[PDB]
């Protein structure tokens, strides 16, 4: 399984006596076991691209051939760990060496083999039974939140010949043995899957269930769906933290994966420092977010292969848990950094560049990356279902949208949560642009909304009309000063302000506004629009002659009602239950309609 | 140690520009250091760039003139370039190769480190905290440098970017509400400026805390590539092993990039965007990101790369690829220079992303954050009013506009204009800020909370 180094021209190492090797196989070059891949082959010689520095590699050094291509090691212990882009545990490398550096040629197993996991068989299988790929034959108890279901690796099947009894096993033991056509396969709790291959599913289903983030904006006006794909701008002042924390903390997904692609060292530190400090209430207990999270960390000075592979390692980990029946939400901190890594490799290989210097296949790689997301029917007899969502961010040089990476991304993702910096400067959070943002899942969710909430859909339509009209009126107001302006337009302007102030704006540093349940979001919007409609009628039905109602009359007449509408965001779901908050909102509507009644 | 006798080869297959192609070489390494002896007794250094079987190709640091293929001998060391490091080398001046040029002895090593090193494990990277004051008000009260960030100075050719760099070396230090060192590397520096740096540091007593590397414009271009690696290797030793804070200033990274392009051509690589290597991004990140704080140790490294913008275009790959992987920018302008303002630093286009953590109670002073934001707004408005004045005249202005013009004139004269030998600590810079802010009545200082005004505004 060894060959020899024939020569080094830089980061590219030529091997000889390496006839038995496949393209994009893995090699460990030299006495330090440098990680690299085989790209070009000719005769019994192979051209190796080495990820790390090749200084010190000699002619005649050994090359160890590893049969598996670039792959992710999947099994118990994946949760709570931080990985390199090529699946190297950073929390073990820093703790097994007492160093601050990642050793050159470091070789730490992705999943430690010194942990004795609590494994319980499915108790449904027997020796002699038939098992197929994707089947679950036992569960490992990792923590209080996520059960780690042990699946038969894809592309394997047969009759079960041995089942381990319940007990404490590590990742190097044998848990299940199966025989197919006389060939016996001994399986541990760990499976390996090539990172560039898509894990098969029974069928790919439409995405219909909303992604229940805690923000009123980026939900009511611009829905995302479990299994859907969106894009988030990444600029210093855009306030992207709000989405990252809200999505990872309060989402209705089961597993969070955060993927770095190649960011500034200090930015990776902020993410690695923040995440371990995040908690959420679960069964009444406050639990660490890292018990249901996995994180992949890559800084700009990491090997380019890892920065390019990081995005595929992340989604491979996501699919692994998807196949368990979990809903997984993966965030790519910057897909622009990934695209930069991809262009660097294309340049290093002297490939013909295309648009703005990027590889010709940039678009194909992004399209095939995002296509891997979605709600699926899983493999295996348990007939379970799950999904992968992607909320990958874009940060093109200059902030422009002409960069092929952002332009291609926007043509692929179905939701765009356009953020802005001006809003942040005005201290308006979350910093959502509104006019640029869009969601193409609105039709997919119409069945969910009709079934569970009924009035939500016409309300969000009216809300967009009111907000858009406020923008449309901007030129008239600037040139007029609200003097030569219709009273019906004054209602739109002031109500749109109410929406912008006490609905779309959300203050995550307050205990009552940490998470806004959907029923509260639609409750608040219903009463605000119901007021809008009543105010429009109050003016229009009396605007003929003699005695007419104006906005100044409405505002002065029922100022307490306009205040009560603004006060609605303070209804803390932790102390005031669903029935109490709905009851208070129902009373507000009645008080509101009755206040208008006195005007007619 | 190796304790293996060295082999010296007289077998030369040919010589092509900076490269010497050797033959029959036994198990050569890539990046191996070798020494040449020419027929005239002249010695040269070089490094092995390609090893294709027994045909090792070495790049000679100095010129290859005089080298034949019959008598020139090549001695192999059996190892790669490892720099002798110690604490004692602080206060010394070296050339790009790591040799002393201050008439002192060769470094008596405490260890040997591979100058390429390794990336710092992100899991143990600590977000930057306290501030390192520079002594220059324009970048202490407006865009401070956090103890662990990497913030570049972009300048056009002809601007006094080297005089500011020297001023930072003389004035920079800790806030002091003995453990601070500066490592200074100049790449492609001309003889006149090299003298400036060396003499200015020695004369003003700062040298005790400076480790200076000078790579001159007429020095080997490959040495220019290791120069910043030697500076950072020293910085890593001093910072992380000897528990102290190191400020690293890399001057004229544009000249580094040009030397890197030359190395790429030596390898016969096809040029990338605008002639530069396709791996320029990862090479700059390799240099820049070897900095910051680490868990469990009290040391830190900061960087202030200084870059000349070709044709004063921030779009150029050199400042573009740098800015894409650094945290903000200082930005030295030309208009301020032509107006004879020193330092000529423009606060409006500059940014320090880590300022939020650098400053505040327990690090500088309570009012630091508030003074900075208000000064920025007042300067931006003053410039806006000045532009208006040019259109409407003096008589068309109201009292508030005149106050902003008074601020604008006194801000540049008192706050930005400093001189090369006046060291303004963070507390004096803020006090100057308040003296300028007290031009306005309290109600015009919209960005300063009333609690801060009541404490600091009067008196």
């Amino acid at each position: 399984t060894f060959g020899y180094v024939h020569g080094v021209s830089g980061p590219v190492v030529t091997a000889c006596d390496m006839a038995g090797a496949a393209m994009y196989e893995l090699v460990r070059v030299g006495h330090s076991e440098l990680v690299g891949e085989i790209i070009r082959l000719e005769g019994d010689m192979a051209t190796i691209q080495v990820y790390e520095e090749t200084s010190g590699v000699s002619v005649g050094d050994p090359v160890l051939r590893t049969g598996k291509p670039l792959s992710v090691e999947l099994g118990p212990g994946i949760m709570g760990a931080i990985f390199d882009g090529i699946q190297r545990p950073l929390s073990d490398i820093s703790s097994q060496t007492q160093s601050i550096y990642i050793p050159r040629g470091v070789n730490v197993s992705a999943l430690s083999r010194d942990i004795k996991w609590e494994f319980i068989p499915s108790k449904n299988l027997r020796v002699g039974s038939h098992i197929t790929g994707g089947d679950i034959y036992g569960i490992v108890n990792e923590n209080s939140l996520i059960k780690h279901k042990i699946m038969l690796p894809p592309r394997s099947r047969g009759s079960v010949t041995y089942i381990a009894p319940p007990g404490n096993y590590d990742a190097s033991d044998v848990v299940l043995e199966l025989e197919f056509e006389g060939v016996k396969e001994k399986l541990s709790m760990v499976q390996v899957w090539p990172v560039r291959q898509v894990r098969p599913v029974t069928e790919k289903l439409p995405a219909n269930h909303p992604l229940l983030t805690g923000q009123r904006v980026l939900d009511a006006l611009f829905p995302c769906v479990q299994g859907g794909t969106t894009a988030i701008p990444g600029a210093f002042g855009c306030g992207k933290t709000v989405i990252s924390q809200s999505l990872s903390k309060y989402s209705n997904s089961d597993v969070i994966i955060y993927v770095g692609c190649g960011e500034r060292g200090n930015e990776m530190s902020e993410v690695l420092r923040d995440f371990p400090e995040l908690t959420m209430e679960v069964d009444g207990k406050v639990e660490s977010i890292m018990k249901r999270t996995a994180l992949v960390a890559n800084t700009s000075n990491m090997p380019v292969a890892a920065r390019e592979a990081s995005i595929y390692t992340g989604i491979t980990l996501s699919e692994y848990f998807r196949d368990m029946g979990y809903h997984v939400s993966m965030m790519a901190d910057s897909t622009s950094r990934w695209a930069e890594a991809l262009r660097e490799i294309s340049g290093r290989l002297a490939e013909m560049p295309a648009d703005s210097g990027y590889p010709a296949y940039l678009g194909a790689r992004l399209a095939s990356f995002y296509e891997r997301a979605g709600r699926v029917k899983c493999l295996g007899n348990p007939e379970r279902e799950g999904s992968v969502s992607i909320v990958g961010a874009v940060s093109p040089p200059g902030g422009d949208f002409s960069d092929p990476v952002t332009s291609a991304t926007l043509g692929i993702v179905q939701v765009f949560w356009g953020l802005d910096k001006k809003l942040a400067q005005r201290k308006h959070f979350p910093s959502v642009n509104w006019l640029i943002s869009y969601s193409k899942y609105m039709r997919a969710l119409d069945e969910y909304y009709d079934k569970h909430f009924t009035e939500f859909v016409p309300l969000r339509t009216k809300a967009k009309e009111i907000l858009q009209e406020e923008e449309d009126l901007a030129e008239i107001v600037q040139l007029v000063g609200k003097a030569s302006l219709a009273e019906t337009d004054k209602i739109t302007l002031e109500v749109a302000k109410l929406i912008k102030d006490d609905f779309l704006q959300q203050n995550g540093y307050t205990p009552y506004d940490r998470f806004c349940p959907f029923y509260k979001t639609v409750g608040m919007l219903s009463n605000m629009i119901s007021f809008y409609d009543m105010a429009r009628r109050a003016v229009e039905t009396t605007a003929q002659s003699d005695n007419k109602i104006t906005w100044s009359i409405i505002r002065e007449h029922m100022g307490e009602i306009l205040y009560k509408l603004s006060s609605m965001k303070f209804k803390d779901p932790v102390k005031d239950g669903e029935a109490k908050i709905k009851a208070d909102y129902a009373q507000l509507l009645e008080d509101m309609q009755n206040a208008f009644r006195s005007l007619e | 140690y190796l304790s293996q006798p060295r082999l010296t080869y007289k077998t030369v297959s040919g010589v092509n520009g900076p490269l010497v192609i050797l033959d029959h070489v036994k198990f050569p390494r890539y990046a191996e250091i070798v020494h040449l002896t020419l027929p005239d007794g002249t010695k040269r250094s070089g490094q092995v760039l390609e090893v294709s079987g027994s045909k090792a190709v070495v790049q000679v640091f100095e010129g290859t003139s005089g080298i034949d293929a019959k008598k020139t001998s090549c001695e192999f060391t059996g190892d790669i370039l490892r720099t002798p490091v110690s604490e004692d080398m602080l206060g010394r001046v070296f050339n790009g190769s790591g040799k002393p040029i201050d008439r002192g002895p060769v470094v008596l090593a405490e260890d040997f480190l591979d100058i390429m090193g390794q990336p710092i494990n992100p899991q143990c990277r600590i977000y930057p905290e306290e501030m390192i004051q520079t002594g220059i008000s324009a970048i202490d009260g407006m865009n401070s440098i956090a103890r662990g960030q990497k913030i570049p100075i972009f300048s056009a050719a002809g601007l006094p970017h080297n005089e500011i760099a020297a001023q930072i070396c003389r004035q920079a230090g800790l806030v002091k509400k003995e453990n601070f060192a500066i490592v200074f590397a100049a790449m492609g520096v001309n003889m006149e400026t090299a003298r400036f740096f060396k003499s200015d540091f020695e004369e003003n007593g700062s040298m005790d805390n400076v480790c200076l590397f000078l790579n001159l414009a007429n020095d080997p271009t490959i040495e220019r590539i290791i120069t910043p690696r030697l500076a950072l290797t020293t910085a890593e030793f001093l910072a992380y092993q000897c528990e102290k804070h190191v400020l690293v200033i890399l001057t004229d990274m544009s000249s580094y990039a040009e030397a890197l392009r030359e190395v790429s051509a030596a390898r016969e690589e096809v040029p990338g965007r605008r002639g530069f290597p396709g791996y320029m991004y990862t090479d700059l990140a390799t240099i820049y990101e070897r900095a910051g704080r680490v868990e469990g140790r009290n040391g830190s490294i900061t960087q202030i790369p200084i870059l000349t913008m070709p044709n004063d275009d921030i779009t150029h790959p050199i400042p573009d690829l740098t800015g894409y992987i650094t945290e903000g920018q200082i930005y030295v302008d030309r208009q301020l220079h032509n107006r004879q303002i020193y330092p000529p630093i423009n606060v409006l286009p500059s940014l320090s992303r880590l300022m939020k953590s650098a400053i505040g109670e327990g690090m500088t002073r309570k009012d630091h954050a508030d003074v900075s934001n208000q000064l920025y707004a007042c300067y931006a408005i003053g410039k806006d009013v000045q532009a208006m004045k040019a259109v409407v005249g003096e008589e068309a202005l109201t009292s508030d506009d005149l106050l902003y013009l008074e601020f604008l004139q006194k801000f540049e004269k008192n706050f930005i204009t400093q001189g090369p030998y006046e060291n303004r600590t963070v507390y004096e810079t803020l006090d100057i800020g308040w003296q300028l802010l007290r031009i306005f009545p309290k109600e015009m200082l919209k960005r300063i909370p009333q609690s801060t005004l009541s404490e600091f505004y009067p008196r």
Binding site: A350, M352 | E268, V270
Partner: peptide, 19 residues
Amino acid sequence: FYRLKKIQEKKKIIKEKSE
């Protein structure tokens, strides 16, 4: 870029023929 790449390949071909 195209022309320079082809030039480098032609040089490589010449070098192989010489061996």
